[PDB]
Write a protein that binds this ligand. Structure first.
Ligand code: HEM
Ligand code: HEM
Ligand SMILES: *[C@@H]1O[C@H](CO)[C@@H](O)[C@H](O)[C@H]1NC(C)=O
Ligand SMILES: *[C@@H]1O[C@H](CO)[C@@H](O)[C@H](O)[C@H]1NC(C)=O
Ligand SMILES: *[C@@H]1O[C@H](CO)[C@@H](O)[C@H](O)[C@H]1NC(C)=O
Ligand SMILES: *[C@@H]1O[C@H](CO)[C@@H](O)[C@H](O)[C@H]1NC(C)=O
Ligand SMILES: *[C@@H]1O[C@H](CO)[C@@H](O)[C@H](O)[C@H]1NC(C)=O
Ligand SMILES: CCCCCCCCCCCC
Ligand SMILES: CCCCCCCCCCCC
Ligand SMILES: CCCCCCCCCCCC
Ligand SMILES: [Mg+2]
Ligand SMILES: [Mg+2]
Lengths: 240, 240
């Protein structure tokens, strides 16, 4: 059914739509999603995320339908549409700059330094390192971004994203909440599945029951606190 | 051309899905949407709203994709899913009870009394009557529902809904912001297009540019103020 050898990595061209999400960009760069990054529906995302990563429909339907709000189309997006600030896209990203003081769309190596340097002395990233990175990235946004938004919702989304890189890029059981640095680094820096380096699609389904306790533990270890508004309101569509 | 003779009203059966929205219920009762009220996509809503009412894609795409959040499916809903409180469904409805103190799903004649009795001495409802109804419905919820939610967002949705019945059920130019009581009453009470009573689909497109000034004027005349935190956060999916 799914043949990874028939899904080679190819660099996106200059008119291939790419977004702020390394998960979806990586699927597109391997043809699990359309390589042009356009006309993508939630069914397409569900199937691509299952085939590529063994991520289940529960989280992809929930996230996907929120992502659909970022376009002007009835049932599709471009991947670039997802950069719409305050729908899903948030400050204190792991690999992108805050929209008020920089580029909220493209991989940025200087931002990524915090993650790349985390968990000193080990060859994996794990739940405690992930939490430390989140704490540090939010401190960076509070220090440098006069428009910073930090809410219960953005904090949960951020922990979700960390749980994603820990699980989808895992070597063994994604339950363990740890992933080889060499796999995660390739994922973010090149938006490529690190097949050559020894990565394989998880044989364990990654769903909400699995991710939940990981998300909550990342949040707990990150020493997160409310800083201001705390209204979990999302942007419901472009140009409002 | 649209043939309404090909789209007769039929009462919903006991396992036909129906929701809190008279607009979409009415389209289903005429087969513009599936009579069973199930497996409804945003494209289906766009086409049905155009064919039945001359409502354009701008508002239906925006509202439709928010409505999709209420189901567990990738790109469809059942009409009943739309009852999900705090996505679109709100307190101080025109024809339904608040969820905390009653049934937020079915037409309720006692609630509907306020609208049915508005604009005394005219045979139309109009912008000032619609505003008075909204003021009175909200006051009712504030008096009887200690859990009332009333925010910039719910207030905008409410004025949008009033603008819809004023425009879609109009006799002449929907621009005028007035509709025969005999048409509107059938719309709410029977969820039927009042063809027998003389109604015809608008020949003027109903879109955001047309609705916007009507919405804003209803709001202005309604002497509205927020309740509590005024947080415009929506519920992003069922069972959270
Ligand atoms: C419905 C599916 C998905 C949608 C709509 C989606 C959307 C997004 C968006 C909008 C962001 C930017 C958040 C920000 O940093 O400001 C993002 C980030 C991220 N997504 Fe996805 N995503 C989805 C699925 C996935 C999958 C399957 C993975 C797999 C690992 C993933 C991993 C990530 C990671 C690691 C980030 C963090 C990037 C950063 O902080 O620099 N996502 N996602
Ligand atoms: C197509 C034209 C539409 C018309 C004419 C229309 C009309 C209305 C009206 C008049 C109400 C208020 C009922 C009341 O307060 O008792 C209402 C409520 C509602 N409509 Fe629609 N609607 C339309 C489209 C939509 C769409 C596309 C969605 C979502 C996909 C939607 C979802 C709802 C919901 C959830 C409510 C419940 C709000 C509440 O009263 O608590 N409607 N609609
Ligand atoms: C998107 O894909 C659908 C089939 O899934 C196709 O009919 C449609 O034309 C495509 N959209 C565009 C704009 O190319
Ligand atoms: C993460 O790895 C570091 C270094 O190996 C270790 O000290 C720490 O206990 C680990 N944390 C978790 C949650 O496994
Ligand atoms: C961001 O903050 C600055 C300085 O506090 C202020 O001038 C500006 O209005 C803010 N911009 C936004 C996006 O609200
Ligand atoms: C609505 O109708 C009433 C009675 O005919 C009238 O007094 C009122 O001015 C009308 N308002 C608008 C906005 O047309
Ligand atoms: C109403 O709000 C209060 C807030 O103090 C809360 O305790 C209660 O559970 C709410 N009731 C309902 C019906 O949810
Ligand atoms: C990209 C993160 C997923 C966004 C989905 C919003 C709902 C809350 C977070 C998902 C896990 C609880
Ligand atoms: C008939 C009820 C739906 C119409 C209005 C919904 C608009 C969605 C939210 C956008 C900001 C108000
Ligand atoms: C959210 C969809 C309905 C919006 C209509 C209310 C305001 C219209 C004019 C305001 C200018 C931005
Ligand atoms: Mg970001
Ligand atoms: Mg209601």
């Amino acid at each position: 059914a799914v043949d990874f050898s028939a899904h080679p990595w190819k660099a996106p061209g200059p008119n291939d739509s790419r977004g702020p999400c390394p998960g979806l960009n990586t699927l597109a760069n391997h043809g699990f999603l359309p390589r042009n990054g356009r006309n993508i529906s939630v069914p397409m995302i569900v199937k691509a995320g299952f085939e590529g990563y063994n991520v289940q429909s529960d989280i992809l339907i929930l996230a996907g339908k929120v992502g659909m709000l970022t376009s002007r189309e009835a049932d599709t997006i471009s991947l670039e549409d997802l950069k719409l600030h305050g729908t899903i896209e948030h400050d204190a990203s792991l690999s992108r700059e805050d929209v008020a003081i920089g580029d909220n769309l493209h991989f940025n190596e200087a931002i990524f330094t915090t993650l790349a340097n985390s968990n000193p002395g080990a060859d994996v990233y794990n739940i405690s390192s992930a939490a430390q990175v989140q704490h540090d990235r939010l401190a960076d946004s509070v220090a440098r971004n006069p428009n910073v938004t930090n809410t219960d919702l953005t904090a949960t989304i951020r922990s979700s994203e960390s749980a994603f890189y820990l699980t989808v890029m895992s070597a063994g059981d994604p339950l363990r909440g740890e992933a080889p640095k060499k796999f995660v680094n390739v994922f973010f820096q090149e938006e490529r599945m690190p097949i050559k380096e020894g990565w394989k699609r998880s044989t364990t389904p990654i769903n909400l029951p699995l991710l939940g306790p990981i998300i909550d533990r990342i949040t707990e270890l990150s020493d997160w606190k409310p800083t201001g508004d705390n209204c979990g309101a999302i942007v419901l569509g472009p140009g409002l």
